[PDB]
Amino acid sequence: EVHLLESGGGLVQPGGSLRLSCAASGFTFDTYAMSWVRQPPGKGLEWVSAISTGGGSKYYADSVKGRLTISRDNSQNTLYLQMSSLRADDTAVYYCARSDFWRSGRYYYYMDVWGRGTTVT
Amino acid sequence: EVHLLESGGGLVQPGGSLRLSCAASGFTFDTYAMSWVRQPPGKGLEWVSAISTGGGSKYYADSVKGRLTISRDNSQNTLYLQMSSLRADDTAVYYCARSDFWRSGRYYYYMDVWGRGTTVT
Amino acid sequence: IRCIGVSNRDFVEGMSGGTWVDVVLEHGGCVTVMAQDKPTVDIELVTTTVSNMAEVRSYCYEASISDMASDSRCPTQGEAYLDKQSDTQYVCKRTLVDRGWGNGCGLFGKGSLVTCAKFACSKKMTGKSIQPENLEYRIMLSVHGSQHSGMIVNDTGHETDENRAKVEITPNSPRAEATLGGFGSLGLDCEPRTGLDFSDLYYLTMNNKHWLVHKEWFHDIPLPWHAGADTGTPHWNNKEALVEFKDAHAKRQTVVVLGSQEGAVHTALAGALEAEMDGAKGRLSSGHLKCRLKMDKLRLKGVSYSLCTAAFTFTKIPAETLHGTVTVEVQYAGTDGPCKVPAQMAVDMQTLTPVGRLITANPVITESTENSKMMLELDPPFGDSYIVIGVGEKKITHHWHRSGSTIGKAFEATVRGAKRMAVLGDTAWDFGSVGGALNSLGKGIHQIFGAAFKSLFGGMSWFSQILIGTLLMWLGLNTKNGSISLMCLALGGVLIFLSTAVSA
Amino acid sequence: IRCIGVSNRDFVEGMSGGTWVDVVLEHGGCVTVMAQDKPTVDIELVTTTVSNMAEVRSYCYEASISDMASDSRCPTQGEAYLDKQSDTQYVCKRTLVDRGWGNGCGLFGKGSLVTCAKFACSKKMTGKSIQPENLEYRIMLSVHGSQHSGMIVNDTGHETDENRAKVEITPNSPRAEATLGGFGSLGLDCEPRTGLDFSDLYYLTMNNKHWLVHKEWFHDIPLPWHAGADTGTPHWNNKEALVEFKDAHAKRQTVVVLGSQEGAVHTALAGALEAEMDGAKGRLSSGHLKCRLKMDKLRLKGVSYSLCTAAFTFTKIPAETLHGTVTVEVQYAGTDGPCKVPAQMAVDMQTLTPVGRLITANPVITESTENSKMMLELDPPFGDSYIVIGVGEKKITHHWHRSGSTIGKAFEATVRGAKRMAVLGDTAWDFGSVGGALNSLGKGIHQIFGAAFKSLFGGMSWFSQILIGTLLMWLGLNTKNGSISLMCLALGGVLIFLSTAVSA
Amino acid sequence: IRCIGVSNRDFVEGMSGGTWVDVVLEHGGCVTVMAQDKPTVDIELVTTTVSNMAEVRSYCYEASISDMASDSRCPTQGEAYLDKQSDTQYVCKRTLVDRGWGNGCGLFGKGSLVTCAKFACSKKMTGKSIQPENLEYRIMLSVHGSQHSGMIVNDTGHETDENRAKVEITPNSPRAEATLGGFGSLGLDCEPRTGLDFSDLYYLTMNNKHWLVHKEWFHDIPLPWHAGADTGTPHWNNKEALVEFKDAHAKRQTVVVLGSQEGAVHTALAGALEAEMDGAKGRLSSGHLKCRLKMDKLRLKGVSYSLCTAAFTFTKIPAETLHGTVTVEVQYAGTDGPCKVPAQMAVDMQTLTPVGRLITANPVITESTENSKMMLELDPPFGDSYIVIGVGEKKITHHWHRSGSTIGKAFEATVRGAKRMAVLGDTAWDFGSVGGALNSLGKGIHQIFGAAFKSLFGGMSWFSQILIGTLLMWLGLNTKNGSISLMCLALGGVLIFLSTAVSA
Amino acid sequence: SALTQPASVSASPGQSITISCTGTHFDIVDYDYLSWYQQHPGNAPKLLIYGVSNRPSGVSSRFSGSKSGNTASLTISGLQAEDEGDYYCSSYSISSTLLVFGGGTKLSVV
Amino acid sequence: SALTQPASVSASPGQSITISCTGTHFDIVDYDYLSWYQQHPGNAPKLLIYGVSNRPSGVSSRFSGSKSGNTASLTISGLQAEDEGDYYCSSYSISSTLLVFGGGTKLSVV
């Protein structure tokens, strides 16, 4: 049904960059605000970034702000993340989660469906 | 075209009776007065009898009158003459003729067409 | 010798000076014409035939509807179509019906519904035009000559004879010269076009029955109809005349075709005239024809006949006709031949001066037969008189009494003239017409007055005429000024008389 | 849940005090009954059958004649006999024709002729009397209960259920007790004998088409008729109505049978009423029945249920009926079972004080299935309002506007009451009647006034009513005093309104 | 931060006490709502779509004719048929033409002629019904929060954000609760059905161009029309509108099909409104929507923030909006984090007591980034002042002059209110509505006066309004009695102002 | 009342011979019902003049009729040889024998 | 303004274990935008409760959330063996880092 597939995760030397990509299917990807959440191995989740339904507004956590950029492309129904100035602290698995952040009526900043995740070093 | 045919002629016994018949064709028999005329061999013409359209009125010459009867059958387009009390004076060739005696507008008591006639002794 | 015993008979007298007389040959009446020294001829219009009839319009009265369907649409939608509004054979109607959730859609109130029924005609009713040309009047002439009572039987048997002639006038041939052999000929200058006014008349035919109907009436009757040019499957125009659409209170719509309407139009054909058809020709009656009679070539046949000198025996008792005229049929014992029958009537036998009149005007035996009969007609004077036929002492004298006083005869002539004026109008002045200036002045005055009368009283029945006439006599007899009073009395009396003359 | 969307619908509110209301069940219309503490019941008269119909008189419209013959006598002879003047199956006429020597006898003038033809009937028109008894009024009542929109379909589809019951009343059983499961029972005290006044009404039948016709009309139609007991080949009375004797000018006499006359009497059936037959029973409509509605054993079924506690959903958008009344259908998601539907309308959703009025008066879900639908009926106030259904935060609200102002509603109620007065007369006062001195008094003066009005203007049409009303308004406005002036004003207004109420 | 510099802007001040205000969301205008301690939200109606459309009728403007044929009948005959009058695809006309021997038959004068032409339509225009249900309103609301000048571009890009929320009001769902994360939620009690009165408004379509036309206009335009239900080969009703029959002097008859009529109906579409279609839905504008704003769950986001302590710098010059209001954008040089932007204005910088007002009501930097910018908005007092931003000595200032005097601002408010009363009628009383009995009484009086005005002057244009208004002022000033003079002066002034306000 | 005719007349071809029929006042002096018939020996009579001076279609214009007083005469101008045959006059008589014929005159061509 | 969670909890099946989440005034006391997520090791997290109390379709009724002041708690009744896994609380913060997560509690079933 509603499936989110990530790609691009892998091993990268510290101080470099990387280009993530999450694919969407089933739901209307253009009407949903998609968010980005990571979890370092053995540690807790932390919301990293979120993008609006159209890419006109970007949000970030105050630990990756100025270092990652979240972008989406509605026509091909996929969303990306832009690594920049990477370091060891970014070693985690990045979960591509669909959010109801700003849709219509009432919302509660929750996340319905999450992807498989990709490994980043 | 407009033809007139007689019948019943032949040698009759002087003193008996006879029924002559005149057959009409071409013209409308119902609209024309019909007349009988005879001429003895070598002698002059003598109008004998005439009948009206429908036979309601009959006229006879005052030499055969009281002994001759003229009749017509409009259904079969035939004209009849009834011989009776025949004598030597009646020995003549009897001619059946079509008369304009009373038609409409103007007439002149003439005869248009004549039959072939029959001989009676 | 027709016209004898018809109770609608007119006598027109041969005037001294001028050898023509103007008569109006009314269909149903008859007129006998006698001049001072001419044979007496009685003239009757017997047939009026219309030949070339153009179909103008056929009406339906026995419609039927077979295929039925309805289409409904919900409120705030378009309109129902049903696809049969595109078929001219179907009669349709659009109405508003109640719609709602129960009826099977969303909103509530006044949906659109159309009902279409396949219209068909079972019995139609055809009208035909009549041109003033291509119609043929037929006139039968009989002479008061030598034929006896015994050729009057089975009249309308238009057979021609030495004493009977048939003339057929048309607008193309309106001036026949009627040869009636022995008596010369009669000249007929007739007016076929100015007869019954066949221009504003139609020939209605429905169910093997025919009428002579007005054009206005025929065009004013509401029924489904198709043009005369319509051939094959008719395209009926006013189908809604015979089909009624009714709705259940607000739920459905029903279609019913109306009844046969044949008795209804029969009731509508009130003042019309019945007519016959000869297979393709419109034989009819109840018209009239105006002719001019030319008696120049009319003259007595046997003016040089020696009078009959033998025994005359009555074959029947003399019989008075409905007009106070005695008819006599006698048999001749002699056999001399064509001879003048001596006949007269005298108030006294001794000084046997002829009195009264003799209609036949030249009784004659035309047969040399020993025993033959002829009829003759005599106009006796009022009071007591004797009808004598013969010369010597072997004659026959029959006493006669006539009850017709001069005042009574004048009154009867007045009522007859009033009746003919009521029937004919200004054409009534052409019946005793020999010319004249007073006659023409009266005819013109009658023409103007009748034109005004038809213009402002034309459409009125007998009851309506009586009502308006009574109201006018009241508006007369009681009124300030006599001039308006006189006019109101004149119109009221005219209307009452016009109702009476046809009522009685 | 019938009566919703019928555009002829009435609301009666039982007053506080007593438990009976008088209603008039007009055929075609309907009425919904709502009391203070009783369920809403909509009650409608559906059918009116007449069982035993006795033939009273049968007319002929498609006559025929088969055996024509004539006999003639000469003047001063006897009279024609023809041997068929003694036969009643033969229609005969005696006339005077012209006789004379041409016709074949001695004297001249006014012979005697008689013509007789064998009359026959091909199609006849039957009339059947209606007795006040042996007529059956079928009435349908439905409860504004739990059933959803989805069973109003196929009205006249007489099937009973929990919320639908059928009562069949008779003048022999005029006191039916309508039992409906759960809601108790309803009592009907009707007056079958005092309904449409079937005493002055026959049942016309003609070519498989039926009407309800007046007695005087059916007794005034001029046609060949016979009393209904005539079995076999009937004896026809007024044969001269469908047979016409015409005489040639003065010669003969002909017989014609007039047309089919069916359409003529269809045109004569102007103010009649169509009807049907069930094989032997004359089912009809356009009647009216006055009943007393006893709601003693009626009581709300839903007073012991908890308010529904789950999410409602609109299955169909709320719609407005033609009376400023909104119809709402919702679906239940919970599986609790029978529960009270919490439904109301408020102008503002903060202080949602109830506004308007709930027609159903007790909306209840009665199904324990997961998803169940059910329908309401509400009476919102003029202007804006919200139709809120549910209690918690998962309610469903629908915006609603109503354009019916209070003054406009009062005027429309006044014209509806005036229409009912025009249709029913004094029986109109028995519709909103719960007794009372003023009601009975006013019905009394209206009864005597209607009696006088029907005796002075009873036999009249729409057009004649308009004419006389305008004439009376003129003889009003322009009059000397004010008493007869007011009389003429009132009479003209009443006549004009009576014409226009049916016209519009 | 929409609604800034739109030139049709409204400021509703939520009064202390009571948490709800009534607004009329006009399509094309906008309104910003600011309560005593709530964040300022500006609300705009962006789109109005109609989802379900029912074809009601389809007119023809590009007709064509192919098969021309004629039939003629001679005088005193019936009527021509031509066999095509039985076909509904053809348009026909019957006429009288001169006939004679030259034309080829017997009589002279007034034959019968019929001409038929096969009608076809090449381009048709379709009208569609609009129900007050199944139409959806979209509402964009933006909070005066974090975002800087830089997100106002592509305002039609209805993208929901942290400061932007999109609600979608439907008559089925008229009570959406707009959640704007951080600032709480806004409650909207809207009235979708009482908007533009879409019941009396079809959706015209012609040549890929759409309009919103009145029902009477669409039903009163004469062209060949077929019902919306008519599917397949259409049956056109009024084919005579686009086909003209002309006769040669007295000899023939010719048919011509008129022009394209597209420009004619464009000129007829005078007071209509253009509209678009999103493929199946009628996206439109120029409507209005009445909503109730529930400010219960609205409240300022960062009240607990600390003031920003770092150097603010102007990035753009403060710009005056069209309503005497100044927009300020500044850049923050601090990285402390989300902090309160200290901004005010004072006439004197020694005793910098705050003067005027602040629209944003809680300017906040929401980014911890080194150099981030935000946007403000202030309501300065009339005269000179200073826009000071920052706390310490490193603050920044901008001299400001506001030229809007208090009397001038009152006059602008009066003209704006009069303009909205002209556009909206009585709904204009619902824009400042927070309740009150004076408001309700005035709205009711305006309701009844507007109903009377619509009845008396409803269908009237700008020029006609001006003409009758001038005539009414003359019938005012020049009049005997003052009451009628006052009424005439008031009506003339109202009509002139109604023309002028849309003119100006 | 019998019409009296001359016994015989003779003429050479190419000339004109006038045959005469005279009668009393019963048949001639009042009525123009005079007809002229040509009878070849054996063949049936044939109408030449029927209206005293009238010619049926199909008869050569060489025959002309006239009436003066009690006698009526027929002229055959431009005579041919084949015109030999009896010539009869028929008149309507106001008597018995409605049609009276002449005695019959033999026409001779030399 | 990060959310603090207990490091781990232990409970036997058939009982109820109350997990708690507390945070500063930036994310909890004013907002109901509180969501609970559970995550089996090597699996994507799953949402159990959103908006403090509301529960998505397809989630057992055993999980009931509530909020009171600085601390909001989630209760799991009728504990089973498969309920082992980490549990997280997420809330909306009025600061940078729009969404903040809890420390993550390792739930253990004994």
**Residue whose pair of structure tokens reads 């509400």 in the numeric block:** D378
D405-501 CATH pick, 1.10.10.10, 1.10.3720.10, 2.60.40.10, 1.20.1280.260: 1.20.1280.260
3 state SS of C290: strand
The answer to whether residues D224 and D238 touch, using CB atoms and an 8 Å cutoff, is yes
| Residue ranges per structural domain of chain D | 1-51+131-198+279-300, 52-61+124-130+199-234+260-278, 62-123+235-259, 301-404, 405-501
Q: Is the CA virtual torsion E359, E362, E365, E366 positive or negative?
A: negative
The CA-atom distances, in angstroms, between D92 and each of D97, D112, D167 are 16, 13, 57
- CA angle in degrees (0–180, nearest 5) for E106-E109-E114: 95
In this complex, do E337 and G95 lie within 8 Å of one another by their Cβ atoms? yes
What does the CA dihedral C341, C346, C352, C356 come to, rounded to 10 degrees?
-80
3 state SS of D49: strand
User: Chain E residue closest to G28 (CA)?
Assistant: E182
- Residue whose C-alpha is closest to residue E139's, from E176, E99, E181: E176
Q: Which residues pair with residue E116 across a beta bridge?
A: E69, E92
The answer to whether residues G14 and G76 touch, using CB atoms and an 8 Å cutoff, is no
Half-sphere exposure of D435 (CA within 13 A, CB side): 8
* CB nearest to E337's CB, from G25, G33, G96: G96
d(CA D492, CA D470): 6
- Joined together, the tokens standing for residue C253 give 């719509």
d(CA E182, CA E165): 12
In this complex, do E78 and C231 lie within 8 Å of one another by their Cβ atoms? no
The CA-atom distances, in angstroms, between E308 and each of C126, D224, E147 are 107, 115, 16
* CATH number of the domain residue A34 falls in: 2.60.40.10
Q: Which fold has domain C52-61+124-130+199-234+260-278?
A: Viral Envelope Glycoprotein; domain 2 (3.30.67)
**Residue whose pair of structure tokens reads 């052999």 in the numeric block:** C181
d(CA F58, CA D423): 92
d(CA E270, CA E461): 10
To the nearest whole Å, the CA of C130 is away from the closest chain E CA by: 8
E301-404 CATH pick, 3.30.1330.90, 2.60.40.350, 1.10.3720.10, 1.10.1060.10: 2.60.40.350
Q: Is the CA virtual torsion C380, C385, C386, C389 positive or negative?
A: negative
- CA angle in degrees (0–180, nearest 5) for E493-E497-E503: 150
Domain ranges, residue A28: 3-101
CB pairs under 8 A between C and D: 157
Number of Cβ within 10 Å of residue G51's Cβ equals 18
Cα A64 to chain centroid, rounded: 12
Which residue in F24, F70, F94 has the most chain C C-beta atoms within 10 A of its own C-beta, making it the best mutation to test that interface? Answer: F94
Experimental approach was cryo-EM
- Class assignment of domain E1-51+131-198+279-300? mainly beta
d(CA C435, CA C443): 11
3 state SS of D452: helix
Q: What are phi and psi of G96, to 5 degrees?
A: -60, 165
**CATH code for F8-109?**
2.60.40.10
Between β-strands E288-294 and E20-26, what pairing exists: parallel, antiparallel or unpaired?
A: antiparallel
To the nearest whole Å, the CA of C41 is away from the closest chain E CA by: 39
- Joined together, the tokens standing for residue A99 give 């959010």
Q: What are phi and psi of C263, to 5 degrees?
A: -65, -30
The answer to whether F39 faces chain B, any CB pair under 8 Å, is yes
Q: Read off the amino acid at residue D447.
A: Q
d(CA C28, CA E429): 93
In this complex, do C157 and B56 lie within 8 Å of one another by their Cβ atoms? yes
Q: What are phi and psi of C365, to 5 degrees?
A: -85, 125
What resolution in angstrom units was achieved for this structure?
Answer: 2.8
d(CA D497, CA G28): 75
In chain F the beta strands, taken as DSSP E runs, fall at 8-11, 17-22, 34-39, 46-49, 63-68, 71-76, 85-92, 99-101, 105-109
d(CA E157, CA E142): 13
- Residue whose C-alpha is closest to residue E313's, from E356, E354, E374: E374
d(CA D355, CA A34): 45
d(CA E221, CA E201): 15
- CA angle in degrees (0–180, nearest 5) for C264-C268-C270: 135
Instruction: Mark out the alpha helices in D166-313 (DSSP H runs).
Output: 215-220, 262-268
**Residue whose pair of structure tokens reads 């409240």 in the numeric block:** E299
CB pairs under 8 A between B and C: 47
If interface means Cβ-Cβ distance under 8 Å, which residues of chain E face chain A? 151, 157, 159-162, 164-168, 176-179, 181, 185, 337, 368-369
The CA-atom distances, in angstroms, between E5 and each of E9, E11, E31, E165 are 8, 13, 12, 20
Residues near G46 by beta carbon (within 8 Å), at least 6 away in sequence? A114, G37, G38, G39
- Joined together, the tokens standing for residue A20 give 């993530």
What is the number of structural domains in chain B?
1
In this complex, do E182 and G95 lie within 8 Å of one another by their Cβ atoms? no
The CA-atom distances, in angstroms, between C408 and each of C324, C379, C382, C403 are 11, 16, 11, 9
Q: Which residues pair with residue D112 across a beta bridge?
A: D73, D96
In this complex, do A95 and G101 lie within 8 Å of one another by their Cβ atoms? no
Residues of C in contact with B103 (CB under 8 A): 160
Instruction: Mark out the alpha helices in C208-291 (DSSP H runs).
Output: 215-220, 262-268
Helix (H) / strand (E) element for D440: namely helix D437-457
In this complex, do F98 and B50 lie within 8 Å of one another by their Cβ atoms? yes
The CA-atom distances, in angstroms, between E191 and each of B38, E20, E137, E196 are 124, 15, 10, 11
User: Chain E residue closest to A102 (CA)?
Assistant: E160
The CA-atom distances, in angstroms, between C271 and each of C201, C213, C284, E360 are 13, 8, 15, 99
The CA-atom distances, in angstroms, between C333 and each of C186, C305, C365, D447, F96 are 33, 17, 11, 97, 17
In this complex, do G96 and E302 lie within 8 Å of one another by their Cβ atoms? no
Residues near C411 by beta carbon (within 8 Å), at least 6 away in sequence? none
d(CA G28, CA E240): 76
Burial class (CB in 10 A: 0-12, 13-18, 19+), D480: exposed
To the nearest whole Å, the CA of C374 is away from the closest chain B CA by: 14
Q: Which residues pair with residue E164 across a beta bridge?
A: E142
In this complex, do E81 and C230 lie within 8 Å of one another by their Cβ atoms? yes
- Residue whose C-alpha is closest to residue D363's, from D407, D331, D335, D333: D331
Residues near D94 by beta carbon (within 8 Å), at least 6 away in sequence? D79, D80, D112, D113, D114
Instruction: Mark out the alpha helices in C98-209 (DSSP H runs).
Output: none
- CA angle in degrees (0–180, nearest 5) for C311-C315-C320: 115
The CA-atom distances, in angstroms, between G13 and each of D186, G7, G17, G109 are 61, 20, 10, 7
Residues near B73 by beta carbon (within 8 Å), at least 6 away in sequence? B79, B80
- Over C310-370, what HEC string results? CCEEECCCCEECCCCCEEEEEEECCCCCCEECCEEEECCCCCCCCCCEECCCCCEECCCCC
The answer to whether F92 faces chain B, any CB pair under 8 Å, is yes
Residues 58-117 (A) with a CB less than 8 A from some CB of G:
59-63, 65, 95, 107-112, 114-117
d(CA D53, CA E491): 70
The answer to whether E88 faces chain C, any CB pair under 8 Å, is yes
The answer to whether residues A18 and A120 touch, using CB atoms and an 8 Å cutoff, is yes
Q: Which residues pair with residue A94 across a beta bridge?
A: A38, A118
Q: Which residues pair with residue E345 across a beta bridge?
A: E387
**CATH code for E62-123+235-259?**
3.30.387.10
Chains that touch F (3 or more CB pairs under 8 A): B, C
Q: How many residues does chain F have?
A: 110
**Residue whose pair of structure tokens reads 């419609």 in the numeric block:** C63
- Joined together, the tokens standing for residue B33 give 């007065």
